[PDB]
Design a binder for this molecule. Structure first.
Ligand SMILES: Cc1cc2nc3c(=O)[nH]c(=O)nc-3n(C[C@H](O)[C@H](O)[C@H](O)COP(=O)(O)OP(=O)(O)OC[C@H]3O[C@@H](n4cnc5c(N)ncnc54)[C@H](O)[C@@H]3O)c2cc1C
Ligand SMILES: NC(=O)[C@H]1C=[N+]([C@@H]2O[C@H](COP(=O)(O)OP(=O)(O)OC[C@H]3O[C@@H](n4cnc5c(N)ncnc54)[C@H](OP(=O)(O)O)[C@@H]3O)[C@@H](O)[C@H]2O)C=CC1=O
Length: 452
């Protein structure tokens, strides 16, 4: 028999793991593999579909690689299966030789400041999910009619949020952005987005192409006050690294530009949100100035000066990181929002593993998940081999039984063939309108088409 591996999730780390498993089988005598991928949503691809911005279609093409893996007869997909709800980790661990958790980071990091729960104060997780038609975020429905939005954070997701808020809706109308978001964006209510970083430009997590792209936003001026660069030296930037060096060149270019009448994307560094205020909704934000100070760890940290400034704002989006969510039956590190592991094997388990953001934390481009997954898979395969040699493998038409069990637990599961129907529907909806697709934005609409 082949080894039977379950993979929980269908984003990049899941698909890289799947590919690594099948490659091992293809290149090793007396080693065969069967991979079942269980995905919470009706649709595969994780953040490649629901995270990557709608104006970033090019990198989404990595999905073709995932599709090629999914064509393998040894691979099966079961969508609309929520592990922790329909089936439990302890059940999967009985039915498979090994289980790989590739669940990513499904929630958000909080600021932990007063007013954070006011209507109008949301996380980028929820805003992005909403604009990308993720079914869990269909009702986020932010009010985008106010003149000023504030985005907290200095990673690339902060740039995505700011771009979507400020891009000409006629441009967004040719993307796969959610129709509900396009509708809210058409009035062009927001005139200024202020991106607020707690540390300085040299500590920014932005990457260079993404900063450069801002120059191509029709109708939008990028605003960086020259004072934001005082004390920011090319020497110090180069010492941080090559990306930082390039970033600072780009930021200097923006600061060199002086205009009434345009929408504005403003960068403020060395600033923290202290409190969000308003009568029943966000109306203003209190900001504090920081200075950089060595903390003894090898880095500089922001230290509050105690100074306070208030700025009117009607939307605050915190882009201060995604965050893992605990899975029933598995260990978890609250502080980091990751599952504790060693070389990808989960604590305390002989046959459960992690890959991707749930393993490493929520950082890295899509490709960073590849070596990560390979490393985990190598460990997994070594451990199976040891078990086989010790006559410690489970004894298992097992593939049929497990599929029947999945169908008993989730009669509305979505197979690969039915995802392909969803996919075709969405693409055919978009192409006549110049869009790659129009997404089905709720579970009900996805299932209307997918189970059909
Ligand atoms: C907003 C945003 C934009 C990004 N843009 C880019 C970009 O332009 N370029 C780039 O290279 N990288 C980009 N990234 C990074 C990229 O998205 C990540 O590196 C990558 O998607 C992480 O992969 P993952 O497999 O760990 O998690 P994910 O892609 O999050 O996949 C996790 C999957 O697990 C599923 N799942 C979760 N819990 C369960 C459960 N209990 N049961 C079943 N299934 C479950 C989820 O539904 C999801 O499909 C972006 C990230 C974000 C957040
Ligand atoms: N085109 C691309 O390559 C893209 C790549 N991604 C990539 O996805 C991941 C996740 O991006 P995301 O922006 O969510 O996270 P990071 O890059 O870690 O940035 C987090 C920022 O949040 C900041 N942060 C965290 N806590 C706070 C508090 N309390 N107050 C203020 N600011 C805070 C953090 O600041 P810090 O460096 O810790 O001082 C980062 O600027 C990251 O690796 C990205 O580069 C995301 C979008 C892309 O477009």
């Amino acid at each position: 028999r082949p080894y039977y591996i379950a993979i929980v999730g269908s984003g990049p780390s899941a698909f890289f793991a799947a590919a690594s498993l099948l490659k091992a089988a293809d290149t090793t005598e007396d080693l065969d593999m069967a991979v079942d991928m269980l995905e919470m949503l009706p649709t595969p691809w994780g953040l490649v579909r629901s995270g990557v911005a709608p104006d970033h279609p090019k990198i989404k093409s990595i999905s073709k690689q995932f599709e090629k893996t999914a064509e393998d007869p040894r691979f099966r997909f079961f969508g609309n299966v929520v592990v922790g709800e329909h089936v439990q980790p302890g059940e999967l661990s009985e039915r498979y030789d090994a289980v790989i958790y590739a669940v990513g980071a499904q929630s958000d990091r909080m600021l932990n400041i007063p007013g954070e729960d006011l209507p109008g104060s949301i996380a980028a997780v929820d805003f992005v999910g909403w604009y990308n038609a993720h079914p869990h975020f269909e009702q986020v429905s932010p009010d985008l009619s106010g003149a000023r939005a504030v985005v907290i954070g200095n990673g690339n997701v902060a740039l995505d949020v700011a771009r979507i808020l400020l891009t000409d809706p006629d441009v967004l109308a040719r993307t796969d952005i959610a129709d509900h978001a396009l509708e809210s964006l058409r009035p062009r209510g927001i005139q200024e987005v202020v991106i607020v970083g707690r540390r300085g430009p040299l500590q920014a997590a932005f990457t260079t192409l993404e900063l450069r792209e801002l120059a191509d936003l029709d109708g939008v001026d990028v605003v960086i006050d020259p004072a934001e660069l005082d004390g920011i030296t090319d020497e110090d930037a180069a010492a941080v690294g090559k990306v930082c060096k390039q970033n600072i060149k780009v930021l200097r270019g923006y600061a060199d530009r002086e205009r009434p009448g345009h929408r504005r994307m403003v960068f403020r560094f060395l600033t923290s949100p202290i409190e969000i205020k308003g009568k029943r909704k966000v109306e203003r934000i209190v900001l504090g100035r920081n200075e950089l100070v060595s903390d003894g760890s090898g880095r500089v940290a922001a230290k509050d000066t105690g100074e306070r400034e208030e700025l009117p704002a009607q939307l605050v989006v915190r882009s201060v990181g995604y965050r893992g969510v605990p899975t029933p039956g598995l260990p978890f590190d609250d502080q980091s929002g990751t599952i504790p592991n060693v070389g990808g094997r989960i604590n305390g388990s002989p046959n459960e593993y992690v890959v991707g953001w749930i393993k490493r934390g929520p950082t890295g481009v899509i490709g960073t998940n590849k070596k990560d997954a390979q490393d985990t898979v190598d460990t997994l395969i070594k451990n199976l081999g040891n078990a086989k040699e010790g006559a410690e493998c489970k004894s298992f038409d097992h593939a049929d039984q497990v599929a029947d069990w999945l169908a008993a637990r989730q009669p509305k599961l979505v197979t690969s063939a039915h995802w392909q129907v969803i996919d075709a529907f969405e693409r055919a909806a978009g192409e006549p309108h110049g869009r790659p697709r129009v997404k089905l934005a709720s579970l009900a609409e996805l299932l209307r088409i997918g189970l059909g």
